[PDB]
Design an enzyme around this catalytic site. Structure first.
Site, short mmCIF file in Angstrom:
data_model
loop_
_atom_site.label_atom_id
_atom_site.label_comp_id
_atom_site.label_asym_id
_atom_site.label_seq_id
_atom_site.Cartn_x
_atom_site.Cartn_y
_atom_site.Cartn_z
N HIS A 91 -3.97 -5.20 4.88
CA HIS A 91 -3.12 -6.29 5.37
C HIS A 91 -1.76 -5.70 5.64
O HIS A 91 -1.54 -4.51 5.50
CB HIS A 91 -3.12 -7.53 4.43
N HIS A 95 1.40 -6.04 4.31
CA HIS A 95 2.47 -5.80 3.35
C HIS A 95 2.70 -4.31 3.16
O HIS A 95 1.84 -3.44 3.42
CB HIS A 95 2.16 -6.53 2.04
N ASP A 100 2.76 -2.42 0.56
CA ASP A 100 1.83 -1.70 -0.31
C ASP A 100 0.55 -1.33 0.42
O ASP A 100 -0.27 -0.60 -0.15
CB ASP A 100 1.51 -2.50 -1.60
N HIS A 123 -4.95 -13.93 -0.13
CA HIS A 123 -3.63 -13.37 -0.42
C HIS A 123 -2.73 -13.36 0.81
O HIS A 123 -1.51 -13.53 0.70
CB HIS A 123 -3.83 -11.95 -0.96
N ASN A 132 1.98 -11.79 -5.98
CA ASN A 132 2.94 -12.25 -5.00
C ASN A 132 2.25 -13.03 -3.91
O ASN A 132 1.48 -12.48 -3.10
CB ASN A 132 3.63 -11.03 -4.45
C1 YUZ Z 1 4.65 -5.59 -1.37
C2 YUZ Z 1 4.24 -6.88 -1.81
C3 YUZ Z 1 4.82 -8.11 -1.16
C4 YUZ Z 1 4.02 -9.26 -1.20
N1 YUZ Z 1 4.63 -10.19 -0.54
N2 YUZ Z 1 5.80 -9.74 -0.10
C5 YUZ Z 1 6.62 -10.65 0.69
C6 YUZ Z 1 6.79 -10.05 2.10
C7 YUZ Z 1 8.10 -9.24 2.05
N3 YUZ Z 1 8.40 -8.32 3.18
C8 YUZ Z 1 5.98 -8.45 -0.43
C9 YUZ Z 1 4.46 -6.93 -3.32
C10 YUZ Z 1 5.69 -6.67 -4.01
C11 YUZ Z 1 5.78 -6.80 -5.39
C12 YUZ Z 1 4.70 -7.17 -6.17
C13 YUZ Z 1 3.48 -7.53 -5.53
C14 YUZ Z 1 2.23 -7.98 -5.97
C15 YUZ Z 1 1.84 -8.23 -7.41
C16 YUZ Z 1 2.70 -8.86 -8.30
C17 YUZ Z 1 2.29 -9.07 -9.61
C18 YUZ Z 1 1.00 -8.74 -10.03
C19 YUZ Z 1 0.64 -9.05 -11.47
S1 YUZ Z 1 -0.27 -10.69 -11.58
C20 YUZ Z 1 -1.75 -10.61 -10.60
O1 YUZ Z 1 -0.78 -10.87 -12.97
O2 YUZ Z 1 0.62 -11.76 -11.07
C21 YUZ Z 1 0.16 -8.13 -9.15
F1 YUZ Z 1 -1.05 -7.69 -9.49
C22 YUZ Z 1 0.56 -7.87 -7.85
C23 YUZ Z 1 1.42 -8.09 -4.85
C24 YUZ Z 1 0.07 -8.62 -4.69
O3 YUZ Z 1 -0.16 -9.73 -5.31
O4 YUZ Z 1 -0.75 -8.14 -3.85
N4 YUZ Z 1 2.12 -7.70 -3.81
C25 YUZ Z 1 3.39 -7.36 -4.16
ZN ZN Z 2 0.13 -8.23 -0.04
ZN ZN Z 3 -0.68 -6.39 -2.91
#
Ligand code: YUZ
Ligand code: ZN
Ligand code: ZN
Length: 232
Positions: free
Chosen positions: A85, A87, A89, A150, A181
Protein backbone atom coordinates in the site's frame (compact mmCIF):
# COMPACT_ATOMS: atom_id res chain seq x y z
CA UNK A 1 19.37 -15.64 18.39
CA UNK A 2 16.36 -17.36 16.84
CA UNK A 3 13.08 -15.83 18.15
CA UNK A 4 11.29 -13.30 15.99
CA UNK A 5 12.86 -9.96 16.63
CA UNK A 6 10.76 -7.28 18.48
CA UNK A 7 10.78 -3.41 18.37
CA UNK A 8 13.13 -2.91 21.33
CA UNK A 9 15.71 -5.38 19.89
CA UNK A 10 16.30 -3.56 16.59
CA UNK A 11 17.93 -0.10 16.61
CA UNK A 12 16.55 2.24 14.03
CA UNK A 13 18.69 1.84 10.89
CA UNK A 14 19.49 -1.91 11.23
CA UNK A 15 17.59 -4.69 9.50
CA UNK A 16 17.18 -8.31 10.50
CA UNK A 17 15.91 -11.21 8.38
CA UNK A 18 13.91 -14.18 9.69
CA UNK A 19 13.57 -17.44 7.82
CA UNK A 20 9.87 -18.27 7.51
CA UNK A 21 10.02 -21.32 5.17
CA UNK A 22 12.27 -22.62 2.44
CA UNK A 23 12.90 -19.67 0.13
CA UNK A 24 10.80 -17.27 2.26
CA UNK A 25 12.12 -14.67 4.73
CA UNK A 26 10.59 -11.74 6.49
CA UNK A 27 12.55 -8.56 6.94
CA UNK A 28 12.19 -6.47 10.11
CA UNK A 29 13.28 -2.88 10.70
CA UNK A 30 12.27 -0.08 13.01
CA UNK A 31 11.48 3.56 12.45
CA UNK A 32 10.49 6.69 14.31
CA UNK A 33 7.16 8.32 13.53
CA UNK A 34 5.62 11.21 15.48
CA UNK A 35 8.06 10.61 18.35
CA UNK A 36 7.55 6.88 18.90
CA UNK A 37 9.44 3.88 17.53
CA UNK A 38 7.72 1.08 15.69
CA UNK A 39 8.75 -2.20 14.06
CA UNK A 40 7.58 -3.19 10.60
CA UNK A 41 7.79 -6.29 8.43
CA UNK A 42 8.27 -7.08 4.75
CA UNK A 43 8.87 -10.25 2.79
CA UNK A 44 11.60 -11.77 0.61
CA UNK A 45 10.79 -14.66 -1.71
CA UNK A 46 13.34 -16.65 -3.68
CA UNK A 47 12.56 -16.46 -7.46
CA UNK A 48 15.13 -19.03 -8.81
CA UNK A 49 18.52 -17.29 -8.65
CA UNK A 50 16.86 -13.91 -7.98
CA UNK A 51 14.79 -12.46 -5.16
CA UNK A 52 11.34 -10.79 -5.07
CA UNK A 53 10.99 -8.15 -2.33
CA UNK A 54 7.66 -7.26 -0.76
CA UNK A 55 7.69 -3.77 0.85
CA UNK A 56 10.52 -1.48 1.77
CA UNK A 57 12.09 -1.37 5.22
CA UNK A 58 10.43 1.99 6.07
CA UNK A 59 12.83 4.67 4.96
CA UNK A 60 15.76 5.27 2.68
CA UNK A 61 18.56 4.33 5.07
CA UNK A 62 16.67 1.34 6.43
CA UNK A 63 16.10 0.13 2.85
CA UNK A 64 19.79 0.53 2.00
CA UNK A 65 20.52 -1.54 5.10
CA UNK A 66 17.99 -4.10 3.95
CA UNK A 67 19.81 -4.56 0.64
CA UNK A 68 23.12 -4.94 2.47
CA UNK A 69 21.60 -7.50 4.88
CA UNK A 70 20.17 -9.51 1.98
CA UNK A 71 23.57 -9.56 0.31
CA UNK A 72 25.24 -10.76 3.49
CA UNK A 73 22.67 -13.42 4.42
CA UNK A 74 21.31 -14.64 1.07
CA UNK A 75 23.63 -13.36 -1.64
CA UNK A 76 21.15 -13.32 -4.51
CA UNK A 77 20.08 -10.13 -6.28
CA UNK A 78 16.80 -8.40 -5.60
CA UNK A 79 15.34 -7.80 -9.05
CA UNK A 80 11.76 -6.76 -8.37
CA UNK A 81 9.78 -5.25 -5.50
CA UNK A 82 6.06 -4.88 -4.82
CA UNK A 83 4.67 -2.37 -2.34
CA UNK A 84 1.44 -3.48 -0.73
CA UNK A 85 0.00 0.00 0.00
CA UNK A 86 0.98 3.65 -0.20
CA UNK A 87 2.23 4.39 3.36
CA UNK A 88 5.88 5.11 4.07
CA UNK A 89 6.43 1.72 5.78
CA UNK A 90 5.69 0.17 2.36
CA UNK A 91 7.10 2.66 -0.23
CA UNK A 92 9.65 4.71 1.72
CA UNK A 93 12.88 3.43 0.23
CA UNK A 94 11.54 2.88 -3.29
CA UNK A 95 13.96 5.53 -4.58
CA UNK A 96 16.87 3.58 -3.00
CA UNK A 97 15.56 0.39 -4.62
CA UNK A 98 15.20 2.05 -7.98
CA UNK A 99 18.79 3.38 -7.82
CA UNK A 100 20.03 -0.09 -6.97
CA UNK A 101 18.44 -1.39 -10.15
CA UNK A 102 15.32 -3.00 -8.60
CA UNK A 103 12.16 -2.75 -10.67
CA UNK A 104 9.45 -1.40 -8.32
CA UNK A 105 5.77 -2.18 -8.70
CA UNK A 106 2.43 -1.29 -7.06
CA UNK A 107 -1.22 -1.09 -8.04
CA UNK A 108 -2.38 2.07 -9.81
CA UNK A 109 -4.39 2.83 -6.67
CA UNK A 110 -1.26 2.68 -4.51
CA UNK A 111 0.70 4.80 -7.01
CA UNK A 112 -1.96 7.52 -7.06
CA UNK A 113 -2.22 7.59 -3.26
CA UNK A 114 1.57 7.62 -2.80
CA UNK A 115 1.88 10.51 -5.24
CA UNK A 116 -0.88 12.48 -3.45
CA UNK A 117 0.71 11.82 -0.01
CA UNK A 118 4.12 12.98 -1.13
CA UNK A 119 5.53 9.49 -0.66
CA UNK A 120 7.91 7.67 -2.99
CA UNK A 121 6.24 6.21 -6.05
CA UNK A 122 6.86 2.70 -7.46
CA UNK A 123 7.68 2.75 -11.17
CA UNK A 124 5.36 0.11 -12.60
CA UNK A 125 1.60 -0.37 -12.31
CA UNK A 126 0.03 -3.69 -11.39
CA UNK A 127 -3.20 -4.06 -13.35
CA UNK A 128 -5.77 -6.72 -12.63
CA UNK A 129 -6.21 -5.91 -8.94
CA UNK A 130 -8.83 -3.23 -8.87
CA UNK A 131 -11.84 -5.19 -7.66
CA UNK A 132 -12.05 -7.04 -4.34
CA UNK A 133 -11.29 -10.72 -4.81
CA UNK A 134 -8.89 -10.08 -7.72
CA UNK A 135 -5.74 -12.09 -7.85
CA UNK A 136 -2.72 -12.05 -10.15
CA UNK A 137 0.56 -13.95 -10.28
CA UNK A 138 3.87 -12.15 -9.81
CA UNK A 139 6.91 -14.37 -9.83
CA UNK A 140 6.66 -16.94 -7.03
CA UNK A 141 3.70 -15.21 -5.33
CA UNK A 142 0.05 -14.45 -5.82
CA UNK A 143 -1.10 -10.90 -5.19
CA UNK A 144 -4.66 -10.51 -3.89
CA UNK A 145 -6.82 -7.47 -3.37
CA UNK A 146 -9.19 -8.24 -0.47
CA UNK A 147 -11.02 -4.93 -0.45
CA UNK A 148 -10.56 -1.87 1.73
CA UNK A 149 -9.20 -2.53 5.23
CA UNK A 150 -6.17 -0.78 6.72
CA UNK A 151 -6.20 1.28 3.53
CA UNK A 152 -8.30 1.24 0.37
CA UNK A 153 -5.38 -0.05 -1.71
CA UNK A 154 -3.94 -2.74 0.59
CA UNK A 155 -2.79 -5.94 -1.09
CA UNK A 156 -1.98 -9.26 0.48
CA UNK A 157 0.60 -11.72 -0.83
CA UNK A 158 0.48 -15.55 -0.82
CA UNK A 159 3.47 -17.83 -1.35
CA UNK A 160 1.86 -21.05 -2.64
CA UNK A 161 5.03 -23.18 -2.37
CA UNK A 162 5.05 -22.64 1.42
CA UNK A 163 1.45 -21.69 2.25
CA UNK A 164 2.70 -18.38 3.62
CA UNK A 165 0.14 -15.55 3.81
CA UNK A 166 1.69 -12.09 4.07
CA UNK A 167 -1.19 -9.91 5.21
CA UNK A 168 0.62 -6.62 5.33
CA UNK A 169 -1.04 -3.92 7.37
CA UNK A 170 -4.51 -5.40 6.83
CA UNK A 171 -3.47 -8.06 9.37
CA UNK A 172 -2.42 -7.49 12.97
CA UNK A 173 -0.38 -9.62 15.32
CA UNK A 174 -2.06 -11.63 18.12
CA UNK A 175 -0.79 -9.48 20.93
CA UNK A 176 -2.24 -6.32 19.42
CA UNK A 177 -4.77 -4.47 21.54
CA UNK A 178 -5.85 -1.91 19.08
CA UNK A 179 -5.89 -1.56 15.38
CA UNK A 180 -2.68 0.40 14.78
CA UNK A 181 -2.75 3.55 12.63
CA UNK A 182 -6.22 3.76 11.21
CA UNK A 183 -6.18 7.17 9.67
CA UNK A 184 -6.68 5.83 6.11
CA UNK A 185 -8.65 2.73 7.13
CA UNK A 186 -12.22 1.63 6.36
CA UNK A 187 -13.20 0.09 9.73
CA UNK A 188 -16.64 -0.93 8.46
CA UNK A 189 -15.33 -2.81 5.39
CA UNK A 190 -12.22 -4.26 7.12
CA UNK A 191 -13.95 -7.35 8.59
CA UNK A 192 -15.51 -8.17 5.21
CA UNK A 193 -12.08 -7.85 3.59
CA UNK A 194 -10.60 -10.17 6.21
CA UNK A 195 -13.37 -12.70 5.63
CA UNK A 196 -12.45 -12.66 1.92
CA UNK A 197 -8.84 -13.41 2.82
CA UNK A 198 -9.98 -16.27 5.08
CA UNK A 199 -12.11 -17.74 2.30
CA UNK A 200 -9.45 -17.43 -0.37
CA UNK A 201 -6.47 -18.82 1.64
CA UNK A 202 -7.85 -21.54 3.92
CA UNK A 203 -4.64 -23.55 3.78
CA UNK A 204 -2.33 -20.77 4.97
CA UNK A 205 0.13 -22.14 7.52
CA UNK A 206 1.99 -18.94 8.48
CA UNK A 207 0.33 -15.52 8.56
CA UNK A 208 2.62 -12.48 8.69
CA UNK A 209 1.24 -9.11 9.84
CA UNK A 210 2.51 -5.75 8.61
CA UNK A 211 3.91 -5.06 12.07
CA UNK A 212 4.78 -7.64 14.77
CA UNK A 213 4.95 -11.38 15.20
CA UNK A 214 3.88 -13.98 12.62
CA UNK A 215 1.50 -16.73 13.67
CA UNK A 216 -1.22 -18.88 12.17
CA UNK A 217 -4.68 -18.29 10.73
CA UNK A 218 -5.82 -16.89 14.14
CA UNK A 219 -4.32 -13.58 13.22
CA UNK A 220 -7.14 -13.05 10.74
CA UNK A 221 -10.02 -13.41 13.21
CA UNK A 222 -8.05 -11.50 15.86
CA UNK A 223 -7.62 -8.63 13.39
CA UNK A 224 -11.36 -8.51 12.74
CA UNK A 225 -11.91 -8.44 16.52
CA UNK A 226 -9.51 -5.59 17.25
CA UNK A 227 -10.86 -3.56 14.36
CA UNK A 228 -14.49 -4.05 15.61
CA UNK A 229 -13.45 -2.95 19.11
CA UNK A 230 -11.94 0.16 17.57
CA UNK A 231 -14.92 1.10 15.38
CA UNK A 232 -16.91 0.62 18.62
C1 YUZ B 1 3.62 4.83 8.35
C2 YUZ B 1 2.34 4.59 8.91
C3 YUZ B 1 1.23 5.61 8.71
C4 YUZ B 1 -0.08 5.11 8.77
N1 YUZ B 1 -0.88 6.09 8.51
N2 YUZ B 1 -0.19 7.21 8.33
C5 YUZ B 1 -0.93 8.42 8.00
C6 YUZ B 1 -0.50 8.90 6.60
C7 YUZ B 1 0.64 9.91 6.85
N3 YUZ B 1 1.46 10.35 5.69
C8 YUZ B 1 1.13 6.99 8.43
C9 YUZ B 1 2.54 4.32 10.41
C10 YUZ B 1 3.20 5.18 11.34
C11 YUZ B 1 3.27 4.84 12.69
C12 YUZ B 1 2.73 3.67 13.19
C13 YUZ B 1 1.97 2.84 12.33
C14 YUZ B 1 1.26 1.65 12.47
C15 YUZ B 1 1.09 0.88 13.77
C16 YUZ B 1 0.84 1.52 14.98
C17 YUZ B 1 0.69 0.77 16.13
C18 YUZ B 1 0.71 -0.62 16.10
C19 YUZ B 1 0.49 -1.36 17.41
S1 YUZ B 1 -1.30 -1.87 17.59
C20 YUZ B 1 -1.75 -2.93 16.24
O1 YUZ B 1 -1.43 -2.75 18.79
O2 YUZ B 1 -2.15 -0.66 17.58
C21 YUZ B 1 0.95 -1.25 14.91
F1 YUZ B 1 1.09 -2.57 14.80
C22 YUZ B 1 1.15 -0.52 13.75
C23 YUZ B 1 0.80 1.29 11.22
C24 YUZ B 1 -0.10 0.20 10.80
O3 YUZ B 1 -1.14 0.03 11.54
O4 YUZ B 1 0.04 -0.38 9.69
N4 YUZ B 1 1.22 2.17 10.36
C25 YUZ B 1 1.94 3.16 10.98
ZN1 ZN C 1 -0.29 1.68 6.38
ZN1 ZN D 1 1.60 -0.39 8.47
Amino acid sequence: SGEYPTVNEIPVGEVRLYQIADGVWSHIATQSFDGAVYPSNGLIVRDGDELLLIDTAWGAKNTAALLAEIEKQIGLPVTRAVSTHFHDDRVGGVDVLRAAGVATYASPSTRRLAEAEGNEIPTHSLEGLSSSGDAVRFGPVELFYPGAAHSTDNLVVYVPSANVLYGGCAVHELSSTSAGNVADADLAEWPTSVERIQKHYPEAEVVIPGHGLPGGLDLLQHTANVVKAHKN
